[PDB]
Amino acid sequence: VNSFSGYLKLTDNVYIKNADIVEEAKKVKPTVVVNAANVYLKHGGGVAGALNKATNNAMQVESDDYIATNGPLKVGGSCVLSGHNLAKHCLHVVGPNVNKGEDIQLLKSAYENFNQHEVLLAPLLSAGIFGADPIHSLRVCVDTVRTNVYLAVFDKNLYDKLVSSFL
Numbered sequence: 001v002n003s004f005s006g007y008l009k010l011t012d013n014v015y016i017k018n019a020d021i022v023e024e025a026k027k028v029k030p031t032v033v034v035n036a037a038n039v040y041l042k043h044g045g046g047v048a049g050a051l052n053k054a055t056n057n058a059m060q061v062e063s064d065d066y067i068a069t070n071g072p073l074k075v076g077g078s079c080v081l082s083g084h085n086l087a088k089h090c091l092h093v094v095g096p097n098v099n100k101g102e103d104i105q106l107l108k109s110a111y112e113n114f115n116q117h118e119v120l121l122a123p124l125l126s127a128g129i130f131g132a133d134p135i136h137s138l139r140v141c142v143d144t145v146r147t148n149v150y151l152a153v154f155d156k157n158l159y160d161k162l163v164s165s166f167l
């Protein structure tokens with residue numbers, strides 16, 4: 001039993017809700033919140049900008065030190081950093097950004113990072129400003145993640161579409 005509330009169950013291990021991931025994180029304080037990161041950990045907009053704003057820019061300060069030490073992430077890769085006031089940990093995962101021409105096949109590699117964590121609160125990778133089809137992203141999630149994932153979808157119209165079209 002965990003504290004996630006109001007989710008629709010899609011599969012044995014995948015759950016979905018129309019929610020603001022920032023508000024969901026502040027209420028649940030999950031062990032892991034996933035950020036929709038880029039390779040530079042520049043949290044300017046989308047999910048990343050919202051998560052970082054909610055940390056009063058502490059996420060960005062920590063991220064800048066990470067990059068200065070380690071260099072950029074790989075597309076499809078991840079790193080574990082602090083969850084600040086939102087979660088114990090933040091798993092920064094880089095999905096491909098279609099608006100940069102990145103290979104959508106890397107989306108599966110991106111979701112594989114979730115399997116290193118037993119339970120996660122996450123957005124749909126490569127959705128939103130990353131330019132991928134969220135219905136495809138949900139399919140890859142379901143077919144790749146084996147650990148327990150709670151997906152927060154900000155847009156109510158999109159949430160209803162994802163549910164209605166789910167196979």
Ligand SMILES: CS(=O)(=O)NC(=O)[C@H]1CN(c2ncnc3[nH]c4cc(F)ccc4c23)CCO1
Pocket residue numbers: 019020021022036045046047048049050123124125126127128129130131152153154155
């Ligand atoms: C690869 S992405 O990060 O750019 N994907 C997207 O942006 C998708 C999904 N986004 C979110 N999903 C869940 N919770 C969210 N809180 C937010 C707060 C914001 F100020 C902006 C977006 C979100 C958001 C919504 C917009 O479209």
